[PDB]
């Protein structure tokens, strides 16, 4: 049926947004780490 | 110690410059990793080195150091019950320091230096010693391993270690000129070890396979080639020989073949029993493994390492069977190296000296009086893998000129599960005549006549097959139908042998003689019945054929009584025809 | 009926990949405009020095004209000519002895060649 | 790390170019070739000297000039970034994704040529694989850790059989003595020299049944650069080895057409002007095919396994052609499709007489499949061979009138071909295939069925051919 597909796509986009949210805090920390590693 | 740098890298071949003074066929350590290589061409200040290990990642300018010595193996206690790579490195100790993958540049002693051995001297101070004499003995696995003087060493004994536990590195004998003699010595793999005399081979190499031991026998010091297409059963025959033959020591060389076969040997052999002494089969065995995906240049080294180890065990008075899993892979390695050398190929791309190398390898076999005065032998069975099954390819043809036995496998028999799949029409043996006195003395006085009659029956059956295909089996006389059926019986009940059956895998000479006697007695009685007006239909329906067919599954212990009851049943059946 | 697994896996993959791409954009924009920090001569000195570490002998070093004089200690020591190309922002490149070999240390190139190894740690730290 | 560039290009001809200086380039290294337009090509150092290094360009050399072309080092050893999220993805055969999803995050960067397995570290392949095909599972059974090619012709349905095996292959741990919940199983699929039509077929097949989720696909198209066909099995086996020996996966590897790979290898070798072989193929083709195939197997102390099924098209159905000849010399057996069985409408057209599984004899028995497996297989082979050798004598004699027991085998042979071999898209279990085999064993229990001595007759005989 269509309902299973709709529920799966909605939960998939929701958890994608959740992973984005829980990356958002550490984005700048990772950026600082990469900046300190690339520079000699 | 000549030291140079890498000038050029192209596959397994490295040009080293600054090597003025390096000697032909000396071992070199290539690169910072110290990869083992061998010089095969010298040109001005440079040297051409063939690397026995992978050359990936080598960089121009890395040092190349020549050891000043040719490719040599360490010969002494500790080789039995072991597996080695192409240049005699223990694969188990390589694993225990490297993991599940074989990385290059690993250095490890061929003989365990920390193991103690029970030294038992035989010489005394003041004795004159020549090459090949026995300094003393050490027990390895029930074998009495003899510590031999190196073949080039002569002198007078100054000191002898009393007794006890020593390692192979501890000098057990010291000569008056300061020459210390250890439990081991090195020998160049490309030099045949000297012997006093070559003897004529007068005893059979019992393989346990009926067709080979009966129709195409090989003598104790002989050589045999077993070429065939893929899946014909070369390796199965080699492993059957390793399991069941009467050799004191078996050396198996996996030259460029599957690793799963070497693993199969390593797993199964410790559980099997040595047919001679009764101990575990692996204590009899030395494995030299260079799988197909191992470095290609190491195949040639592995062949020489195997044959040199076999010769060393021959020098101690043992009879040694050397199995080469495929000499075609060694030939292909030679072709690749020759192509790197820009040599002009002779035939199908092989170098022109291929036949010379094969002849020098197969010439090391033979029954000899060793330098120590004992009698030893090396038997070589070398498998060949002709491309597309073409027996006209250079390796097969150059092999046939030197081998004494030719065990030709057939694809048509292998497809139809008729194993061992020996083409008895194309095969031959040149040792059959010379072994006749031994067969008469040890099996039966009339054994050669039984064998000749069986071969004649096979010849007649093969001839009548053409008439069968032309006219049809229905429209030929009952005598020829009897010949056809007796040939079928011979094939399926005597020539066929299941190497995986717990009983059929091994067959003694007397069991084969009994089966031949059964078949020939049945044939003569059925021929008399045909002359007696008996129709072949009821002859073919006789239950005695079931006894004849099941004879080969009878164990060696039961077979002497089964043979007697089968003889009586054969008599009674054609007596009952009246 | 089983397409939900494909949807969830695709969504998570797209999310993580877009997040990593955003991290790349952030780090490349922050890596831009290094000379605005007055500590830049001290790092570009080592940036030029590692070029001479790579090249046992260099004929000349090429960079933005304003970036040249800060590195001229190496010019005095090695005798390397200083060559100007303003398009070579945030980087140092050198010409070998024969002119055939050359090395480049532009910051964007270092980021591009390091990101493949760095992403393994970045993804684990980010999640 | 800093980037060094070499501008000393002195010679370009065909696929090779020479770079002067460049003694810093290690042998076998991977390089990036950049021309004046900014396009970047790939290349591999195939020969390095003091005076120059020799690079084989991955693509065509069109557009390269000695004035502006620059060569730079990428890595001394070709490596592939691998991770567990590769499952469900697709790649072009050089590692680049072609599924539209973003690139994976590399957990490890393994060299793509691998390293030889130490023979003392291996163990004997001992667990069978249920492919769902009776003529394989019963008579030529596939064992975890085996390499077992499928020999096929140009007109035979090899791709369909490959897809069916990929869909149906399963571990069957319930029958195993070590009964347990199923261990992870995965399929790595490598397509070499494949057409767009076959690619669409495979993508549709993997999508329509969800097998894609437990699969990794490497797809090299026929119009892709020829070097990517060489590199494709390296990437596939690198991924398979990573999964199996670092995450305990049971990996089944399928190589779609090794004939295309060997044609690519011949092209590359002739480009390098090597010594030729039997039919123009390089003399070292055995070594290369061995370095591909020998990577399969089972390792002592590790739960995972790698199984290979290389499908190849025998040119002109000639088994003595170099490709099938060397493949048979390397692999442990072969599955050969019959064109005559294809003409009779039988699918899958596997001919059991010339097919062989070397590792079969130690992969079946008690605790593995059923206790009667080997005896049943022996009996089926013997009976089918007897039927075939009866029908071949009928042609020469030209007489249907023959002994009564012969007609039982002719009928047995016809029923065997029409029911056991001919199974269509049915996913027969090993128990189902054994039931079909025992039903086909309608021959006399003792007067016939005498090739293999067995007392399993009292347990399984008497079936009346009834189907579902
Ligand atoms: N004497 C035999 N008894 C029983 N089975 C046999 C025998 N010889 C061969 N076979 C079978 O046939 C297969 C072929 O084995 P081998 O003869 O070892 O192959 P080969 O001659 O080494 O050729 P390859 O595959 O290129 S190494 C074996 O795995 C067995 O299944
Ligand atoms: Mg073999």
Mark the residues whose beta carbon lies below 5 A from ion ligand 2: B 234-235
Supply D94's token pair: 């050089």
- Give the C-alpha separation, D414 to C43, whole Å: 83
Supply D79's token pair: 């490596």
Residues 6+ apart with CB under 8 A from D207: none
**DSSP letter assigned to residue D350:** B
Buried b (16+ CB within 10 A) or exposed e, D303-338: ebbbbbbbbbbbbebebebbbbbbbbbbbbbbbbbb
- Give the C-alpha separation, C43 to C46, whole Å: 5
Q: How far is CA B93 from CA B82, B98, B281, B400, C51, in A?
A: 10, 8, 21, 39, 44
Buried b (16+ CB within 10 A) or exposed e, C36-46: eeeebeeebbe
Cα-flanking dihedrals φ and ψ of residue D206, to 5°? Answer: -75, -30
> Of the bound ligands, which one is closest to the alpha carbon of residue D377?
1
Listed by number, the residues of chain B in 130-149 with a beta carbon closer than 8 Å to a beta carbon of chain D are none
Residues 6+ apart with CB under 8 A from D245: B100, D299, D302, D304, D306
Assess whether chains C and D touch, using the rule of 3 or more C-beta pairs within 8 angstroms: yes
Cα-Cα-Cα-Cα torsion B389, B391, B396, B401, nearest 10 degrees, comes to 160
Contacts 24+ apart (CB under 8 A), D247-250: D247/D84, D247/D184, D247/D304, D248/D183, D248/D184, D248/D302, D248/D303, D248/D304, D249/D183, D249/D184, D249/D185, D249/D186, D249/D304, D250/D144, D250/D171, D250/D183, D250/D184, D250/D185, D250/D186, D250/D304, D250/D305, D250/D307
Residues 6+ apart with CB under 8 A from B320: B247, B248, B249, B250, B251, B310, B311, B313, B314, B376, B377, B378, B379
Q: What is the 3-state secondary structure (H, E, C) of chain A?
A: CHHHHHHHHHHHHHHHHHHHHHHHCCHHHHHHHHHHHHCC
Report the number of distinct structural domains present in chain D.
1
Pick from D203, D195, D258: nearest CA to D230: D258
What pairing do the DSSP bridges indicate for beta strands B428-429 and C58-63? unpaired
Helix B298-315, helix B327-340: angle, nearest 10: 130
Q: Tell me the residue ranges of DSSP E strands in D112-149.
A: 122-123, 128-129, 142-143
Residues 6+ apart with CB under 8 A from B473: B481, B484, D393, D397
**Is D466 a member of any domain?**
no
- Using the Cβ of B352 and the Cβ atoms of chain D, whether some distance falls under 8 Å is answered with no
**Cβ contact, residue pair C105, D21, below 8 Å:** no
Pick from C40, C42, C21: nearest CA to C89: C40
3-state secondary structure of B415: helix
- Give the C-alpha separation, B511 to B556, whole Å: 7
For residue D226, what are the domain limits? 3-461
Pick from B18, B53, B47, B20: nearest CA to B34: B53
Give Cα B1 distance to the centre of its chain: 38
- Residue B307 in contact with residue B280, Cβ under 8 Å? no
Residue B252's CB is within 10 A of a number of other CB atoms, namely 24
Pick from B96, B11, B86, B107: nearest CA to B50: B11
**Is D382 a member of any domain?**
yes
Supply D348's token pair: 């899958």
Nearest C-alpha in C relative to D108: C120
Q: What is the DSSP string of B447-506?
A: HHHHHHHHHHHHHHHHHHHHHHHHH-GGGS-HHHHHHHHHHHHHIIIII---TTSTTTT-
- Residue B489 in contact with residue B482, Cβ under 8 Å? no
Q: How far is it between the farthest Cα atoms of chain A?
A: 58
- Residue B174 in contact with residue B159, Cβ under 8 Å? yes
Residue A38 Cα, gap to closest chain C Cα (Å): 6
Q: How many CA atoms are closer than 13 Å to the CA of B60, on its beta-carbon side?
A: 20
- Residue B530 in contact with residue B484, Cβ under 8 Å? no
**Is D228 a member of any domain?**
yes
What pairing do the DSSP bridges indicate for beta strands D215-221 and D90-91? parallel
- Give the C-alpha separation, B371 to C30, whole Å: 82
**Is D38 a member of any domain?**
yes
With 0-12 CB in 10 A as exposed, 13-18 as middle and 19+ as buried, what is C29?
exposed
Contacts of A20 in chain C (CB under 8 A): 15, 18-19
Residues 6+ apart with CB under 8 A from D110: D79, D80, D82, D238, D241, D242
- Using the Cβ of C65 and the Cβ atoms of chain D, whether some distance falls under 8 Å is answered with no
With 0-12 CB in 10 A as exposed, 13-18 as middle and 19+ as buried, what is C122?
buried
Q: What is the 3-state secondary structure (H, E, C) of B110-167?
A: CCCCCCCEEEEECCCCCCEECCCCEEEEEECCCCEEEEECCCCCCEEEEEECCCEEEC
- Give the C-alpha separation, D5 to D22, whole Å: 9
**Is D42 a member of any domain?**
yes
Residue appearing with tokens 């290589």: B37
Residue D203 Cα, gap to closest chain C Cα (Å): 14
Supply C12's token pair: 């998570």
Q: Terminus-to-terminus CA distance in chain B, angstroms?
A: 91
Nearest C-alpha in B relative to D29: B57
Residue appearing with tokens 């954009």: C25
3-state secondary structure of B25: coil
Residues 6+ apart with CB under 8 A from D63: D35, D36, D37, D39
Chains near B, with 3+ CB pairs < 8 A?
Answer: D
Buried b (16+ CB within 10 A) or exposed e, C101-118: bbbbbbbeebbebebeeb
Q: How far is CA D288 from CA A32, D293, D466, in A?
A: 46, 9, 49
**Is D36 a member of any domain?**
yes
Pick from B379, B334, B78: nearest CA to B207: B379
Ligand 1 pocket list (CB less than 6 A)? B 228, 230-236, 257, 419-420, 497-500; D 329, 358
Pick from C57, C63, C118: nearest CA to C91: C63
**Is D468 a member of any domain?**
no
Question: Among B207, B227, B228, B232, which residue has the most ligand 1 atoms within 8 Å of its CB, making it the best to mutate?
Answer: B232
What pairing do the DSSP bridges indicate for beta strands D3-6 and C101-104? antiparallel
Cα-flanking dihedrals φ and ψ of residue D356, to 5°? Answer: -155, 140
Helix D373-397, helix D404-415: angle, nearest 10: 120
Residues 6+ apart with CB under 8 A from D157: D337, D342, D347, D348, D349
Contacts of C15 in chain A (CB under 8 A): 16-17, 19-20
Q: CA triplet D37, D42, D46: central angle to 5 degrees?
A: 130
- Give the C-alpha separation, B196 to C24, whole Å: 79
Pick from D381, B192, D102, B410: nearest CA to C24: D102
Pick from B258, B259, B236, B226: nearest CA to B379: B226
Residue C2 Cα, gap to closest chain D Cα (Å): 7
**Cβ contact, residue pair C105, D3, below 8 Å:** yes
- Residue B511 in contact with residue B560, Cβ under 8 Å? no
- Give the C-alpha separation, B296 to D290, whole Å: 11
Resolution limit, Å: 2.7
Residue appearing with tokens 């004035």: D67
Instruction: Please tell me the residue having the least CA distance from ligand 1 atom 15.
Output: B233
In ligand 1, the atom with minimum distance to the C-alpha of B235 is 18
Q: How far is CA B539 from CA B145, B527, B545, in A?
A: 58, 10, 9
Cα-flanking dihedrals φ and ψ of residue B245, to 5°? Answer: -75, 165
Of B9, B266, B416, Cβ closest to residue D27: B9
What pairing do the DSSP bridges indicate for beta strands B249-255 and D79-82? unpaired
- Give the C-alpha separation, B77 to B67, whole Å: 25
3-state secondary structure of B16: strand
The continuous run of DSSP H or E covering D386 comes out as helix D373-397
Compute chain D's Rg from CA coordinates: 25
Please, which residues bridge with residue D19 across strands? D9, D53
With 0-12 CB in 10 A as exposed, 13-18 as middle and 19+ as buried, what is D137?
buried
Supply D402's token pair: 């023959």
The sign of the torsion formed by the CA atoms of D169, D175, D181, D183 equals: negative
- Using the Cβ of C103 and the Cβ atoms of chain A, whether some distance falls under 8 Å is answered with no
Torsional class of C9: left (φ above 0), alpha (ψ -120 to 50), beta (otherwise): alpha
- Residue B169 in contact with residue B113, Cβ under 8 Å? yes
Torsional class of B144: left (φ above 0), alpha (ψ -120 to 50), beta (otherwise): beta
Pick from D234, D233, D236, D381: nearest CA to D312: D233
- Residue B382 in contact with residue B327, Cβ under 8 Å? yes
Residue B571 Cα, gap to closest chain D Cα (Å): 25
Q: CA triplet D212, D213, D214: central angle to 5 degrees?
A: 90
Please, which residues bridge with residue B384 across strands? B227
- Give the C-alpha separation, C97 to D426, whole Å: 71
**Cβ contact, residue pair D105, C16, below 8 Å:** yes
Pick from B17, B8, B50, B24: nearest CA to B337: B50
Please, which residues bridge with residue B35 across strands? B30
Give Cα B85 distance to the centre of its chain: 17
**Cis, peptide link before residue D144, omega less than 30° from 0:** no
Nearest C-alpha in C relative to A25: C126
Please, which residues bridge with residue B5 across strands? B17, B63
- Residue B378 in contact with residue B322, Cβ under 8 Å? yes
- Give the C-alpha separation, B286 to B283, whole Å: 8
**Is D467 a member of any domain?**
no
Of D121, D329, D358, Cβ closest to residue B95: D121
- Give the C-alpha separation, C22 to C16, whole Å: 10
Is residue A13 marked as binding? Answer: no
Cα-Cα-Cα-Cα torsion D390, D391, D397, D401, nearest 10 degrees, comes to 80
Residues 6+ apart with CB under 8 A from B108: B89, B90, B93, B94, B97
Q: What is the DSSP string of chain C?
A: -THHHHHHHHHHHHHHHHHHHHHHHHHHHHHS-GGGSTTHHHHHHHHHHHHHHH-SSEEEEEE-GGGSGGGHHHHHHH-PEEEE-TT-TT--EEEESSSSEEEE--HHHHHHHHHHHHHHHHHHHH-
- Residue B171 in contact with residue B152, Cβ under 8 Å? no
**Cis, peptide link before residue B370, omega less than 30° from 0:** no
With 0-12 CB in 10 A as exposed, 13-18 as middle and 19+ as buried, what is D340?
exposed
């Amino acid at each position: 049926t269509e309902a299973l597909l709709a529920r799966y796509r909605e939960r998939a986009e929701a958890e994608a947004k959740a992973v984005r949210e829980k990356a958002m805090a550490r984005l700048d920390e990772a950026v600082a780490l990469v900046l300190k590693e690339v520079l000699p | 110690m000549i030291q140079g740098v890498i000038q050029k890298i192209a596959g397994p071949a490295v040009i080293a410059k600054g090597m003025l003074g390096a000697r032909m066929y000396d071992i070199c350590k290539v690169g910072e990793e110290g990869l083992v290589g061998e010089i095969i061409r010298l040109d001005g200040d440079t040297a051409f080195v063939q690397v026995y290990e992978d050359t990936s990642g080598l960089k121009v300018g890395e040092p190349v150091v020549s050891t000043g010595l040719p490719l040599a193996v360490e010969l002494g206690p500790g080789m039995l019950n072991g597996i080695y790579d192409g240049i005699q490195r223990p694969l188990e100790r390589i694993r225990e320091k490297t993991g599940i993958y074989i990385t290059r540049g690993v250095v490890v002693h061929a003989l365990d230096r920390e193991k103690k051995w029970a030294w038992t001297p035989m010489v005394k101070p003041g004795d004159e010693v020549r090459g090949g004499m026995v300094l003393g003995t050490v027990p390895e696995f029930g074998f009495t391993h003899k510590i031999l003087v190196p073949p080039d060493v002569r002198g007078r004994v100054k000191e002898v270690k009393p007794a006890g536990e020593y390692t192979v590195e501890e000098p057990v004998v010291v000569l008056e000129d300061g020459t210390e003699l250890k439990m081991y010595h090195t020998w160049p793999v490309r030099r045949a070890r000297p012997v006093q005399r070559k003897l004529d081979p007068n005893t059979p190499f019992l393989t346990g396979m009926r067709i080979l031991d009966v129709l195409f026998p090989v003598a104790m010091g002989g050589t045999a080639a077993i070429p065939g297409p893929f899946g014909a059963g070369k390796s199965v025959t080699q492993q059957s020989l390793a399991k069941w033959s009467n050799a004191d020591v078996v050396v198996y060389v996996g030259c460029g073949e599957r690793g799963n076969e070497m693993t199969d040997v390593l797993v199964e052999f410790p559980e099997l029993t040595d047919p001679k002494t009764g101990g575990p089969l692996m204590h009899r065995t030395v494995l030299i493994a260079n799988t197909s995906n191992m470095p290609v240049a190491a195949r040639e080294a592995s062949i020489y390492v195997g044959v040199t180890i076999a010769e060393y065990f021959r020098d101690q008075g043992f009879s040694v069977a050397l199995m080469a899993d495929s000499t075609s892979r060694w030939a292909e390695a030679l072709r690749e190296i020759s192509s790197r050398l820009e040599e002009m190929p002779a035939e199908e791309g092989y170098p022109p000296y291929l036949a010379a190398r094969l002849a020098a390898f197969y010439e090391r076999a033979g029954k000899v009086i060793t330098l120590g005065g004992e009698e030893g032998a090396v038997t070589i069975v070398g498998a060949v893998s002709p491309p597309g099954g073409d027996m006209s390819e250079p390796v097969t043809q150059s092999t046939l000129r030197i081998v004494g036995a030719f065990w030709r496998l057939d694809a048509s028999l292998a497809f139809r599960r008729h194993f061992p799949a020996i083409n008895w029409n194309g095969s031959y043996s040149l040792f059959t005549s010379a072994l006749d006195p031994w067969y008469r003395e040890n099996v039966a006085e009339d054994y050669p006549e039984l064998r000749d009659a069986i071969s004649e029956l096979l010849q007649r059956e093969a001839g009548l097959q053409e008439i069968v295909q032309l006219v049809g089996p229905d429209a030929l006389q009952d005598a020829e139908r009897l010949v056809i059926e007796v040939g079928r019986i011979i094939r399926e009940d005597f020539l066929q042998q299941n190497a995986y059956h717990e009983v059929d895998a091994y067959c003694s000479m007397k069991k084969a003689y009994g089966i031949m006697k059964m078949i020939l007695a049945f044939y003569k009685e059925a021929e008399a019945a045909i002359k007696r007006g008996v129709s072949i239909d009821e002859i073919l329906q006789l239950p005695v054929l079931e006894r004849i067919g099941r004879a080969r599954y009878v164990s060696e212990e039961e077979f002497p009584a089964y043979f007697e009851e089968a003889m009586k049943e054969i008599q009674g059946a054609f007596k009952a025809l009246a | 009926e089983s397409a939900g697994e494909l949807l969830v896996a695709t969504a998570r993959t797209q999310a993580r990949g877009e997040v990593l791409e955003e991290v790349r954009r952030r780090v490349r924009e922050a890596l831009e405009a290094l000379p605005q920090k007055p500590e830049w001569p001290e790092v570009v000195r080592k940036l030029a020095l590692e070029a001479l570490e790579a090249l046992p002998g260099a004929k000349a070093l090429v960079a933005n004209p304003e970036d040249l004089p800060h590195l001229e200690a190496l010019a005095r020591e090695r005798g390397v000519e200083l060559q100007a190309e303003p398009a070579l922002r945030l980087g140092v490149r050198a010409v070998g002895a024969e002119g055939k070999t050359q090395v480049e240390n532009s910051l964007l190139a270092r980021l591009d060649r390091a990101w493949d190894a760095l992403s393994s740690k970045v993804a684990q730290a980010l999640w | 790390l800093l980037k060094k560039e070499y501008t000393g290009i002195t010679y370009i001809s065909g696929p090779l170019l020479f770079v002067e200086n460049a003694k810093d380039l290690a042998y076998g290294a991977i390089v990036d070739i950049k021309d004046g337009t900014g396009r970047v090509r790939g290349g591999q150092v195939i020969e390095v000297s003091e005076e120059y290094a020799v690079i084989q360009v991955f693509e065509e050399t069109t557009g390269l000039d000695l004035a502006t072309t620059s060569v730079s080092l990428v890595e001394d050893v070709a490596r592939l970034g691998v991770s567990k999220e590769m499952l469900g993805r697709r790649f072009n055969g050089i590692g680049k994704p072609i599924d539209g999803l973003p690139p994976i995050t590399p957990e490890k960067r393994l060299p793509i040529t691998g390293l030889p397995l130490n023979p003392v570290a291996r163990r004997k392949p001992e667990q069978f694989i249920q492919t769902g095909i009776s003529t394989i599972d019963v008579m030529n059974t596939l064992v975890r850790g085996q390499k077992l090619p499928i020999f096929s012709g140009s007109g035979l349905p090899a791709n369909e059989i490959a897809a069916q095996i990929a869909r149906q292959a399963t571990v069957r741990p319930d029958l195993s003595g070590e009964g347990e919940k199923e261990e992870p199983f995965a399929v790595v699929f490598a397509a070499m020299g494949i057409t767009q039509r076959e690619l669409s077929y495979f993508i549709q097949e993997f999508e329509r049944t969800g097998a894609l989720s437990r699969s990794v696909l490497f797809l090299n198209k026929a119009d892709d650069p020829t070097i990517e066909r060489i590199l494709t099995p390296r990437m596939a086996l690198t991924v398979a080895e990573y999964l199996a020996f670092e995450h305990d996966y049971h990996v089944l590897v399928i190589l779609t057409d090794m004939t295309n790979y060997c044609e690519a290898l011949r092209e590359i070798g002739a480009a390098r002007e090597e010594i030729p072989g039997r039919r123009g193929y390089p003399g070292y083709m055995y070594t290369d095919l061995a370095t591909i195939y020998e990577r399969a197997g089972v390792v002592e102390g590790k739960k995972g396994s790698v199984t290979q099924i290389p499908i190849l098209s025998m040119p002109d159905d000639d088994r003595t052609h170099p490709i099938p000849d060397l493949t048979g010399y390397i692999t442990e057996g072969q599955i050969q499709l019959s064109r005559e069985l294809h003409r009779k409408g039988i699918y899958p057209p596997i001919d059991p007489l010339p097919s062989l599984s070397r590792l079969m004899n130690n992969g079946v028995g008690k605790g593995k499949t059923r206790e009667d497996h080997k005896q049943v297989s022996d009996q089926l082979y013997s009976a089918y061979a007897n039927g075939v050798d009866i029908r071949k004598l009928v042609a020469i004699i030209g007489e249907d009138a023959l002994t009564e027991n012969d007609r039982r085998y002719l009928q047995f042979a016809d029923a065997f071909e029409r029911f056991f071999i001919n199974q269509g898209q049915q996913n027969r279990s090993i128990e189902e295939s054994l039931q079909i085999a025992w039903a086909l064993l309608s021959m006399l229990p003792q007067g016939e069925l005498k090739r293999i001595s067995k007392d399993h007759i009292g347990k399984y005989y008497g079936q009346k051919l009834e189907e579902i």
